[model samples]
Target: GSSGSSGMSASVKESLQLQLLEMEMLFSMFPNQGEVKLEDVNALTNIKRYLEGTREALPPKIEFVITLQIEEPKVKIDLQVTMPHSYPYLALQLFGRSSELDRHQQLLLNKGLTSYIGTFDPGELCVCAAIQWLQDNSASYFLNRKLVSGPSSG
Candidate 1:
C-alpha cells in the first residue's frame, strides 16, 4: 500500500528521518539535564499515585512541551505531545502553547496528526512523524496569523 520512492507511508518515514536529524542537532543547542525514564522508581511511584483505586494499571501517558525558534518566520514554536497508553492505536495529540493559534487550527492540526499516525499499525512508533508534521505545518500557521494581524499595537 506504499511506494519506496513516494506515498503517504513513505512520506511519514521520510519525515521521521528528517526529524531525527533535526533533534540530533538540537540536542547540543539545549541543556542536557538528566532524563527520567518510565521504568525509573520515581516515575513508577508517580504513576502508582494516579492508579491507586483504578482497576487497570495506570495509563502510560507522558506529556511535555518543547520550544524552538523558527528562522523562516521569526517565530517561536512551542509544542507539546501527550502520548497515550495505546500509542500508535490512540495516536498522539499535539498542543500549541501560543494563543496565536486559533481553536479551529489547533483542532485541525490535532485531527490531521491523528489521522496520519493512524495509518501505521499499532506497534509502530509515530512520534517522529508527529514531530515532523509540527515542524513543517504548525509554525507556519502561527506566522500567517501574525502577519494578518499586522504589527502589534502593544
Candidate 2:
C-alpha cells in the first residue's frame, strides 16, 4: 500500500528498499507481467525492512520490513526502476495534480513527494529508472514526456 501522507502517491521506504524493489521487479519480470509467483515475491519483499514497522525494543535499532501482499490472478508487480526522466517530471506532474488539495495538505504532500523523488540518492535515482521502465514497456496510460533519467542510468 502507498503512504497516507503521500496521498495515494508512490514511495520507497528507503534507498535500499528502493533498490530491492527494483531488483525484485527485474527478477520477477522473468516470469512475465502479472504472472510471477506470490511465494517468490513475498520472499523477496520479506527482506525489505519497513514492511510492518517492527520494533526492536532492546537497543531500539530500526529496520524497514518489506512485505509483498499479492492475490494471484491479480498479482501486484512492483518495479521501482524507471528511466531517469520520469522521476523529476512525474514529480512535477504530481505537484500539479496536488494543487486540488488543501494548502497545508499540499505542503505536506510536496515534502513527502519530494523525498520520494528529486533526491540525488541512488535509491531515488533507481526509482527514476523504474518510472522510465513503465514508460517504455507500456504503450497506454503514460505521461509520455521525455525524462531526464529516461535515457541514462542514474
User: Residue 25 in candidate 1 has what lDDT?
Assistant: 42
RMSD of each: 10.9, 17.0
Error of 2 at 61 (Å): 16
**Looking at candidate 2, what is the lDDT of residue 101?**
34
lDDT of 2 by residue, 1-154 (tens): 5445644333333433444455555445345544332334443444453434572221111122221222322223232222222332233222311222345544553355445455454324333333333333323322235555746566
The TM-score, computed over Cα atoms with residue i paired to residue i, of candidate 2 is 0.21
lDDT of each: 0.51, 0.35
lDDT of 1 at 114: 67
Q: After superposition, how far is residue 71 of candidate 1 from its true place, in Å?
A: 3.3
Poorly placed runs, candidate 2 (over 4 Å): 1-12, 28-45, 49-51, 55-121, 125-154
